[model samples]
Target: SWQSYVDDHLMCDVEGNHLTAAAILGQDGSVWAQSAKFPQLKPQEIDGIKKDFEEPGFLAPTGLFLGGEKYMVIQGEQGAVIRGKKGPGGVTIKKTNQALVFGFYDEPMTGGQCNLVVERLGDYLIESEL
Candidate 1:
C-alpha cells in the first residue's frame, strides 16, 4: 500500500539516481529512449505492443512499459538499447543498445555524479553514479 500501483508489482529501487531519466528526440521530433522504469512514468516509443498505456498480459504489473499517449509495449530485455546524438539539429537518435541489467539500489548523495544499476528478473535500471 505504500508503493505505487506499478511499483508494487514490478522490480524497483529508489536508491541512487532513480530520477535521472534518458531519451533521444527523433529527426521528425519523435521521442526515442528507454521507457521510464519507475515512479515518474513518462511516454516514448514502445515496441512489441500496438498502443501506449495498454499493458500486455506478458508484462508484469511492475514490468517497465514504454510508449506515449499513442502507444505502449514490452519490448525491453536486458540488453535492448536505443541511441541519441547532439548535433546541428539540436540532438537526434544515433544508436540503440540492449540495456544490460545492472541492478538497482538507493542513493544518498546528490549532484551529477552518481550511476548505479539495480537488477530484477533479468531487467534492470541504473540506480545512480557517485
Candidate 2:
C-alpha cells in the first residue's frame, strides 16, 4: 500500500525536519507525474489544520518520532494539472483526486520519480504513514 511504503521510509529530526522524500507515482503508464508537493508545516500549523479540518490526523500523536510525527490527512478533492502561461504543461501525470484520507509531506519532492502506484477504490490515499 502507499501508506506502507511511506511509513517504511519516513523519518525526521528532533525539530521535525524530514530526512527524505517520497513520490505518489501514476499507474496508467502515462508520461505525466502523480504527486503533491508539501513543504513541512510547523507543529502549530499542523495543529491548526487538525483543528480546522477535524481530520483524524489531528487526533493522532505529533512529534519527531516515527509514530509521533505529524500526519497531514486530506481527501482527494479533484485532479487538476498545474497550469502556466503556456498552452499546457508537459507530461500530464494522470491523477484522480477522488476522495480518501492522505498524509502531507514535510517538503516538496527532491525529484520526479514514480514508484509502483496503486488505486485505492474510487479515491487514492497518499500517505507518509511513518
Candidate 3:
C-alpha cells in the first residue's frame, strides 16, 4: 500500500502537469531529490521560486499568506482541454525544517493535503535523521 500511496498521492499527472514531482532544496538553494521532469521547475525556476519567496513585497505578486507563512500558488493560462477553460492548477511551495518542499497539482487538491504532505515529510525528516 505504500507503493500505491506514493503512486496515487505523490506521482500523479494531469494534462502533462506533474502533480508530485518533489525535491528538497537546501537553504543555500541547491537541489536534492528533484524529479527529472518536476513539472515546470528548472534550476533557474527554482531560483525564481526562492527569490519570489524571499523578497515578496507586493512587487512580485505571488502567493498568499496562510498561518503567517507564505504558500506560493502560481497558475497558468488555459492550455490543455483537461485543464478546462480557466486552467486552475498550481504548485504549493513551503519551507520546512529540512528544506523547501513543493507540491504541484490541479484544483482538486486541498489545503489539508498540502498540510499533510508537509507534516509527513517533516516527520520523515525527523525519523530518518535526514
Candidate 4:
C-alpha cells in the first residue's frame, strides 16, 4: 500500500542526509502517503505545482511556501523536478505517473542529496506504473 512506504521507506532517514518530512500526493490533489510530520499542503499550492509542470515558470513569481517557510523554487527538469530552498531547510518535489513525491530536509541535508531519494522514489513509482 502507498501508506506503507511513508514510514518504512520515505521518512526512514537514509544516507547522505536524513529527510525531515515527505509526502506522496496524487496529481488530482489527493493524499496518497505522507510522513507523520508532513505539513498540510493547501490544494491551491498543489494545483500550482501541477500547473508548473505543464507550463514552466508558473511558480516563479510567488514561489512556494510550505509549513510556514518561504522557499525559492527552481524547476530543475520542467516536469521532473522542483527544488525549494530556504534558510537551513529545503524541499524537493518530483513528478511521476499520476503523483508527485515530496522530500523535505534541513541543515546538513543538501537539496541535491534530498533529490537523490525523492527522485529515486519518483522513478520507482514510474516504473511501477503508479
Q: Which candidate is the best by TM-score?
A: 4
Using lDDT as the measure, name the better of candidate 1 and candidate 3: 3
Tell me the lDDT of candidate 2: 0.27
Worst 10 residues of 1 by lDDT: 85-94
14-124: candidate 1 lDDT, tens digit per residue: 442342333323223343333364222243333422221133343333333333221122233223321111121111111222222211122342211212222221132
- What C-alpha lDDT values do all the predictions have? 0.26, 0.27, 0.45, 0.81
What's the true lDDT of residue 95 in model 3? 55
lDDT for residue 55 in candidate 4, whole number 0-100? 86
The residue-by-residue lDDT of candidate 2 on 46-130, one tens digit each, is: 2443343333233224321112343322222123221111111111111334222222222332111111111221123433221
For model 4, residues 1-130, the per-residue Cα lDDT tens digits are 7886666567766564578888998888788988878998777788778888888787878887665567898657887888888887788888998898999989787777788888888898899997
Which is the leading candidate under lDDT?
4
- Which residue pairs clash within candidate 3? none
Q: Each model's TM-score?
A: 0.19, 0.21, 0.47, 0.89
Q: To one decimal, what is the Cα RMSD in angstroms of model 1 from the true structure?
A: 14.1
Model 3: per-residue Cα lDDT over 10-80, one tens digit each: 45554443453555556455655555455433465555555554545421354433223334443321110
lDDT of 2 at 16: 38
TM-score of 2: 0.21
**Which stretches of model 3 miss by more than 4 angstroms?**
1-18, 40-44, 58-86, 119-130
